[PDB]
PDB file of all heavy atoms in Angstrom:
ATOM      1  N   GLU Y   1      75.866 -45.329  -6.166  1.00 59.47           N
ATOM      2  CA  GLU Y   1      76.755 -45.420  -4.985  1.00 59.47           C
ATOM      3  C   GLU Y   1      77.735 -46.587  -5.202  1.00 59.47           C
ATOM      4  O   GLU Y   1      77.318 -47.672  -5.623  1.00 59.47           O
ATOM      5  CB  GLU Y   1      75.897 -45.596  -3.741  1.00 59.47           C
ATOM      6  CG  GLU Y   1      76.682 -45.541  -2.453  1.00 59.47           C
ATOM      7  CD  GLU Y   1      75.843 -45.728  -1.199  1.00 59.47           C
ATOM      8  OE1 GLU Y   1      74.706 -46.267  -1.297  1.00 59.47           O
ATOM      9  OE2 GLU Y   1      76.331 -45.340  -0.122  1.00 59.47           O
ATOM     10  N   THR Y   2      79.014 -46.372  -4.921  1.00 60.39           N
ATOM     11  CA  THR Y   2      80.063 -47.410  -5.074  1.00 60.39           C
ATOM     12  C   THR Y   2      80.818 -47.607  -3.751  1.00 60.39           C
ATOM     13  O   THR Y   2      81.602 -48.561  -3.659  1.00 60.39           O
ATOM     14  CB  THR Y   2      81.029 -47.072  -6.214  1.00 60.39           C
ATOM     15  OG1 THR Y   2      81.505 -45.743  -5.996  1.00 60.39           O
ATOM     16  CG2 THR Y   2      80.409 -47.173  -7.600  1.00 60.39           C
ATOM     17  N   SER Y   3      80.631 -46.737  -2.758  1.00 59.98           N
ATOM     18  CA  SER Y   3      81.489 -46.727  -1.546  1.00 59.98           C
ATOM     19  C   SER Y   3      80.657 -46.217  -0.385  1.00 59.98           C
ATOM     20  O   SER Y   3      80.113 -45.117  -0.500  1.00 59.98           O
ATOM     21  CB  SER Y   3      82.720 -45.865  -1.714  1.00 59.98           C
ATOM     22  OG  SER Y   3      83.562 -45.940  -0.570  1.00 59.98           O
ATOM     23  N   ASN Y   4      80.604 -46.973   0.704  1.00 59.49           N
ATOM     24  CA  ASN Y   4      79.989 -46.493   1.955  1.00 59.49           C
ATOM     25  C   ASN Y   4      80.827 -47.015   3.117  1.00 59.49           C
ATOM     26  O   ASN Y   4      80.817 -48.206   3.413  1.00 59.49           O
ATOM     27  CB  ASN Y   4      78.527 -46.909   2.004  1.00 59.49           C
ATOM     28  CG  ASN Y   4      77.807 -46.318   3.191  1.00 59.49           C
ATOM     29  OD1 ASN Y   4      78.428 -45.972   4.199  1.00 59.49           O
ATOM     30  ND2 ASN Y   4      76.503 -46.191   3.055  1.00 59.49           N
ATOM     31  N   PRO Y   5      81.614 -46.159   3.798  1.00 67.64           N
ATOM     32  CA  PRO Y   5      82.499 -46.650   4.853  1.00 67.64           C
ATOM     33  C   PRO Y   5      81.729 -47.137   6.091  1.00 67.64           C
ATOM     34  O   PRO Y   5      82.340 -47.774   6.921  1.00 67.64           O
ATOM     35  CB  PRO Y   5      83.395 -45.444   5.157  1.00 67.64           C
ATOM     36  CG  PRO Y   5      82.524 -44.255   4.791  1.00 67.64           C
ATOM     37  CD  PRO Y   5      81.749 -44.708   3.568  1.00 67.64           C
ATOM     38  N   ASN Y   6      80.432 -46.852   6.166  1.00 67.80           N
ATOM     39  CA  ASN Y   6      79.560 -47.293   7.281  1.00 67.80           C
ATOM     40  C   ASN Y   6      79.068 -48.731   7.059  1.00 67.80           C
ATOM     41  O   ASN Y   6      78.537 -49.296   8.011  1.00 67.80           O
ATOM     42  CB  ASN Y   6      78.365 -46.359   7.458  1.00 67.80           C
ATOM     43  CG  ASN Y   6      78.759 -45.018   8.032  1.00 67.80           C
ATOM     44  OD1 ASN Y   6      79.845 -44.858   8.584  1.00 67.80           O
ATOM     45  ND2 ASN Y   6      77.869 -44.052   7.938  1.00 67.80           N
ATOM     46  N   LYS Y   7      79.186 -49.278   5.846  1.00 66.18           N
ATOM     47  CA  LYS Y   7      78.747 -50.670   5.548  1.00 66.18           C
ATOM     48  C   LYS Y   7      79.800 -51.637   6.061  1.00 66.18           C
ATOM     49  O   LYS Y   7      80.983 -51.392   5.912  1.00 66.18           O
ATOM     50  CB  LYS Y   7      78.508 -50.836   4.047  1.00 66.18           C
ATOM     51  CG  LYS Y   7      77.229 -50.166   3.582  1.00 66.18           C
ATOM     52  CD  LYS Y   7      76.974 -50.262   2.097  1.00 66.18           C
ATOM     53  CE  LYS Y   7      76.561 -51.645   1.674  1.00 66.18           C
ATOM     54  NZ  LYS Y   7      76.055 -51.639   0.281  1.00 66.18           N
ATOM     55  N   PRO Y   8      79.404 -52.768   6.687  1.00 66.75           N
ATOM     56  CA  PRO Y   8      80.371 -53.747   7.166  1.00 66.75           C
ATOM     57  C   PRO Y   8      81.081 -54.349   5.941  1.00 66.75           C
ATOM     58  O   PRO Y   8      80.519 -54.323   4.838  1.00 66.75           O
ATOM     59  CB  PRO Y   8      79.486 -54.755   7.900  1.00 66.75           C
ATOM     60  CG  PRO Y   8      78.190 -54.699   7.124  1.00 66.75           C
ATOM     61  CD  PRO Y   8      78.012 -53.226   6.834  1.00 66.75           C
ATOM     62  N   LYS Y   9      82.290 -54.840   6.156  1.00 64.26           N
ATOM     63  CA  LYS Y   9      83.211 -55.347   5.115  1.00 64.26           C
ATOM     64  C   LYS Y   9      83.512 -56.815   5.388  1.00 64.26           C
ATOM     65  O   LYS Y   9      83.762 -57.175   6.545  1.00 64.26           O
ATOM     66  CB  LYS Y   9      84.546 -54.595   5.149  1.00 64.26           C
ATOM     67  CG  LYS Y   9      84.486 -53.152   4.671  1.00 64.26           C
ATOM     68  CD  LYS Y   9      85.848 -52.502   4.457  1.00 64.26           C
ATOM     69  CE  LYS Y   9      86.762 -52.518   5.672  1.00 64.26           C
ATOM     70  NZ  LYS Y   9      86.125 -51.861   6.842  1.00 64.26           N
ATOM     71  N   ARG Y  10      83.530 -57.630   4.345  1.00 64.31           N
ATOM     72  CA  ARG Y  10      84.109 -58.979   4.444  1.00 64.31           C
ATOM     73  C   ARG Y  10      84.735 -59.350   3.110  1.00 64.31           C
ATOM     74  O   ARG Y  10      84.227 -58.925   2.060  1.00 64.31           O
ATOM     75  CB  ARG Y  10      83.075 -60.012   4.902  1.00 64.31           C
ATOM     76  CG  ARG Y  10      81.912 -60.256   3.948  1.00 64.31           C
ATOM     77  CD  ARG Y  10      81.008 -61.320   4.550  1.00 64.31           C
ATOM     78  NE  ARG Y  10      79.992 -61.685   3.586  1.00 64.31           N
ATOM     79  CZ  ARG Y  10      79.111 -62.660   3.703  1.00 64.31           C
ATOM     80  NH1 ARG Y  10      79.039 -63.392   4.805  1.00 64.31           N
ATOM     81  NH2 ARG Y  10      78.268 -62.871   2.711  1.00 64.31           N
ATOM     82  N   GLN Y  11      85.795 -60.143   3.180  1.00 64.97           N
ATOM     83  CA  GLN Y  11      86.410 -60.787   1.996  1.00 64.97           C
ATOM     84  C   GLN Y  11      85.817 -62.186   1.901  1.00 64.97           C
ATOM     85  O   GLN Y  11      85.745 -62.880   2.943  1.00 64.97           O
ATOM     86  CB  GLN Y  11      87.930 -60.852   2.128  1.00 64.97           C
ATOM     87  CG  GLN Y  11      88.545 -59.546   2.601  1.00 64.97           C
ATOM     88  CD  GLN Y  11      87.982 -58.361   1.857  1.00 64.97           C
ATOM     89  OE1 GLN Y  11      88.257 -58.135   0.702  1.00 64.97           O
ATOM     90  NE2 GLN Y  11      87.178 -57.550   2.495  1.00 64.97           N
ATOM     91  N   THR Y  12      85.327 -62.564   0.731  1.00 68.19           N
ATOM     92  CA  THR Y  12      84.824 -63.943   0.500  1.00 68.19           C
ATOM     93  C   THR Y  12      85.475 -64.496  -0.757  1.00 68.19           C
ATOM     94  O   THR Y  12      85.904 -63.688  -1.619  1.00 68.19           O
ATOM     95  CB  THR Y  12      83.295 -64.029   0.420  1.00 68.19           C
ATOM     96  OG1 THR Y  12      82.856 -63.344  -0.751  1.00 68.19           O
ATOM     97  CG2 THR Y  12      82.591 -63.455   1.632  1.00 68.19           C
ATOM     98  N   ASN Y  13      85.529 -65.818  -0.850  1.00 65.25           N
ATOM     99  CA  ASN Y  13      86.036 -66.532  -2.051  1.00 65.25           C
ATOM    100  C   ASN Y  13      85.227 -66.081  -3.274  1.00 65.25           C
ATOM    101  O   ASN Y  13      85.818 -65.880  -4.365  1.00 65.25           O
ATOM    102  CB  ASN Y  13      85.947 -68.049  -1.880  1.00 65.25           C
ATOM    103  CG  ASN Y  13      87.035 -68.598  -0.987  1.00 65.25           C
ATOM    104  OD1 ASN Y  13      88.025 -67.915  -0.720  1.00 65.25           O
ATOM    105  ND2 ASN Y  13      86.855 -69.828  -0.527  1.00 65.25           N
ATOM    106  N   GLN Y  14      83.921 -65.911  -3.103  1.00 64.99           N
ATOM    107  CA  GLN Y  14      83.022 -65.611  -4.231  1.00 64.99           C
ATOM    108  C   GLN Y  14      83.224 -64.162  -4.673  1.00 64.99           C
ATOM    109  O   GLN Y  14      83.353 -63.967  -5.880  1.00 64.99           O
ATOM    110  CB  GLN Y  14      81.583 -65.928  -3.866  1.00 64.99           C
ATOM    111  CG  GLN Y  14      81.354 -67.410  -3.604  1.00 64.99           C
ATOM    112  CD  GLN Y  14      79.887 -67.693  -3.420  1.00 64.99           C
ATOM    113  OE1 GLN Y  14      79.129 -66.850  -2.952  1.00 64.99           O
ATOM    114  NE2 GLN Y  14      79.482 -68.908  -3.776  1.00 64.99           N
ATOM    115  N   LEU Y  15      83.297 -63.190  -3.753  1.00 62.29           N
ATOM    116  CA  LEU Y  15      83.531 -61.781  -4.175  1.00 62.29           C
ATOM    117  C   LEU Y  15      84.908 -61.641  -4.854  1.00 62.29           C
ATOM    118  O   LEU Y  15      85.008 -60.908  -5.841  1.00 62.29           O
ATOM    119  CB  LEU Y  15      83.360 -60.848  -2.975  1.00 62.29           C
ATOM    120  CG  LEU Y  15      81.903 -60.685  -2.519  1.00 62.29           C
ATOM    121  CD1 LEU Y  15      81.790 -60.034  -1.150  1.00 62.29           C
ATOM    122  CD2 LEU Y  15      81.112 -59.923  -3.563  1.00 62.29           C
ATOM    123  N   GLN Y  16      85.948 -62.306  -4.346  1.00 62.89           N
ATOM    124  CA  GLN Y  16      87.309 -62.250  -4.931  1.00 62.89           C
ATOM    125  C   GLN Y  16      87.248 -62.794  -6.361  1.00 62.89           C
ATOM    126  O   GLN Y  16      87.813 -62.176  -7.252  1.00 62.89           O
ATOM    127  CB  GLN Y  16      88.307 -63.014  -4.070  1.00 62.89           C
ATOM    128  CG  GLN Y  16      88.592 -62.318  -2.746  1.00 62.89           C
ATOM    129  CD  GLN Y  16      89.498 -63.075  -1.800  1.00 62.89           C
ATOM    130  OE1 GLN Y  16      90.180 -62.465  -0.978  1.00 62.89           O
ATOM    131  NE2 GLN Y  16      89.508 -64.404  -1.871  1.00 62.89           N
ATOM    132  N   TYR Y  17      86.529 -63.893  -6.570  1.00 61.22           N
ATOM    133  CA  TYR Y  17      86.400 -64.498  -7.921  1.00 61.22           C
ATOM    134  C   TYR Y  17      85.609 -63.563  -8.848  1.00 61.22           C
ATOM    135  O   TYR Y  17      85.993 -63.400 -10.025  1.00 61.22           O
ATOM    136  CB  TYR Y  17      85.786 -65.883  -7.756  1.00 61.22           C
ATOM    137  CG  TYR Y  17      85.463 -66.599  -9.035  1.00 61.22           C
ATOM    138  CD1 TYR Y  17      86.342 -67.425  -9.669  1.00 61.22           C
ATOM    139  CD2 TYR Y  17      84.245 -66.463  -9.618  1.00 61.22           C
ATOM    140  CE1 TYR Y  17      86.014 -68.100 -10.838  1.00 61.22           C
ATOM    141  CE2 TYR Y  17      83.901 -67.115 -10.786  1.00 61.22           C
ATOM    142  CZ  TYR Y  17      84.785 -67.939 -11.415  1.00 61.22           C
ATOM    143  OH  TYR Y  17      84.369 -68.562 -12.545  1.00 61.22           O
ATOM    144  N   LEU Y  18      84.571 -62.910  -8.335  1.00 60.36           N
ATOM    145  CA  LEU Y  18      83.749 -61.996  -9.170  1.00 60.36           C
ATOM    146  C   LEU Y  18      84.627 -60.837  -9.664  1.00 60.36           C
ATOM    147  O   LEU Y  18      84.443 -60.394 -10.803  1.00 60.36           O
ATOM    148  CB  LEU Y  18      82.550 -61.516  -8.354  1.00 60.36           C
ATOM    149  CG  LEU Y  18      81.441 -62.559  -8.231  1.00 60.36           C
ATOM    150  CD1 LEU Y  18      80.436 -62.210  -7.156  1.00 60.36           C
ATOM    151  CD2 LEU Y  18      80.768 -62.728  -9.582  1.00 60.36           C
ATOM    152  N   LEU Y  19      85.594 -60.397  -8.867  1.00 65.25           N
ATOM    153  CA  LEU Y  19      86.463 -59.279  -9.290  1.00 65.25           C
ATOM    154  C   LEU Y  19      87.622 -59.806 -10.137  1.00 65.25           C
ATOM    155  O   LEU Y  19      87.788 -59.303 -11.258  1.00 65.25           O
ATOM    156  CB  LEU Y  19      86.986 -58.515  -8.075  1.00 65.25           C
ATOM    157  CG  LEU Y  19      87.968 -57.388  -8.403  1.00 65.25           C
ATOM    158  CD1 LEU Y  19      87.368 -56.335  -9.334  1.00 65.25           C
ATOM    159  CD2 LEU Y  19      88.487 -56.766  -7.110  1.00 65.25           C
ATOM    160  N   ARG Y  20      88.389 -60.785  -9.650  1.00 61.84           N
ATOM    161  CA  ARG Y  20      89.666 -61.202 -10.292  1.00 61.84           C
ATOM    162  C   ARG Y  20      89.431 -62.056 -11.544  1.00 61.84           C
ATOM    163  O   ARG Y  20      90.340 -62.101 -12.400  1.00 61.84           O
ATOM    164  CB  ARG Y  20      90.535 -62.006  -9.328  1.00 61.84           C
ATOM    165  CG  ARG Y  20      91.082 -61.212  -8.154  1.00 61.84           C
ATOM    166  CD  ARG Y  20      91.774 -62.184  -7.211  1.00 61.84           C
ATOM    167  NE  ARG Y  20      91.895 -61.683  -5.848  1.00 61.84           N
ATOM    168  CZ  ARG Y  20      92.240 -62.427  -4.801  1.00 61.84           C
ATOM    169  NH1 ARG Y  20      92.495 -63.720  -4.950  1.00 61.84           N
ATOM    170  NH2 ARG Y  20      92.301 -61.877  -3.600  1.00 61.84           N
ATOM    171  N   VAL Y  21      88.315 -62.764 -11.640  1.00 61.52           N
ATOM    172  CA  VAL Y  21      88.057 -63.670 -12.794  1.00 61.52           C
ATOM    173  C   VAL Y  21      86.924 -63.100 -13.651  1.00 61.52           C
ATOM    174  O   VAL Y  21      87.131 -62.906 -14.848  1.00 61.52           O
ATOM    175  CB  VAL Y  21      87.725 -65.095 -12.316  1.00 61.52           C
ATOM    176  CG1 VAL Y  21      87.200 -65.957 -13.456  1.00 61.52           C
ATOM    177  CG2 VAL Y  21      88.923 -65.744 -11.639  1.00 61.52           C
ATOM    178  N   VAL Y  22      85.761 -62.852 -13.073  1.00 61.28           N
ATOM    179  CA  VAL Y  22      84.547 -62.565 -13.882  1.00 61.28           C
ATOM    180  C   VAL Y  22      84.638 -61.149 -14.460  1.00 61.28           C
ATOM    181  O   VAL Y  22      84.534 -61.007 -15.683  1.00 61.28           O
ATOM    182  CB  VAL Y  22      83.266 -62.778 -13.071  1.00 61.28           C
ATOM    183  CG1 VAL Y  22      82.044 -62.429 -13.897  1.00 61.28           C
ATOM    184  CG2 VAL Y  22      83.172 -64.204 -12.534  1.00 61.28           C
ATOM    185  N   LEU Y  23      84.754 -60.137 -13.605  1.00 59.11           N
ATOM    186  CA  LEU Y  23      84.895 -58.723 -14.050  1.00 59.11           C
ATOM    187  C   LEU Y  23      86.082 -58.648 -15.023  1.00 59.11           C
ATOM    188  O   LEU Y  23      85.929 -58.121 -16.141  1.00 59.11           O
ATOM    189  CB  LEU Y  23      85.034 -57.803 -12.826  1.00 59.11           C
ATOM    190  CG  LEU Y  23      84.914 -56.291 -13.069  1.00 59.11           C
ATOM    191  CD1 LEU Y  23      86.162 -55.754 -13.735  1.00 59.11           C
ATOM    192  CD2 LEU Y  23      83.701 -55.946 -13.907  1.00 59.11           C
ATOM    193  N   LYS Y  24      87.226 -59.197 -14.648  1.00 56.85           N
ATOM    194  CA  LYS Y  24      88.432 -59.149 -15.508  1.00 56.85           C
ATOM    195  C   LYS Y  24      88.101 -59.681 -16.906  1.00 56.85           C
ATOM    196  O   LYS Y  24      88.381 -58.974 -17.874  1.00 56.85           O
ATOM    197  CB  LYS Y  24      89.604 -59.913 -14.893  1.00 56.85           C
ATOM    198  CG  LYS Y  24      90.838 -59.938 -15.782  1.00 56.85           C
ATOM    199  CD  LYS Y  24      91.999 -60.711 -15.229  1.00 56.85           C
ATOM    200  CE  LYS Y  24      92.693 -61.503 -16.315  1.00 56.85           C
ATOM    201  NZ  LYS Y  24      93.868 -62.249 -15.805  1.00 56.85           N
TER     202      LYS Y  24
END
């Protein structure tokens, strides 16, 4: 599973870094 529109959403400094720096 990669997507569930029923799950609550938040933007965090740590999630942004995991995508833009670490995953990249």
Side-chain angles (χ1 to χ4, degrees):
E1 187 181 20
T2 52
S3 184
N4 186 336
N6 288 343
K7 286 178 73 168
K9 289 191 304 303
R10 65 179 187 173
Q11 314 314 288
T12 67
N13 283 344
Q14 296 187 330
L15 288 166
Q16 290 176 153
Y17 175 91
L18 283 166
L19 176 59
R20 292 173 202 168
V21 169
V22 178
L23 192 286
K24 177 182 140 178

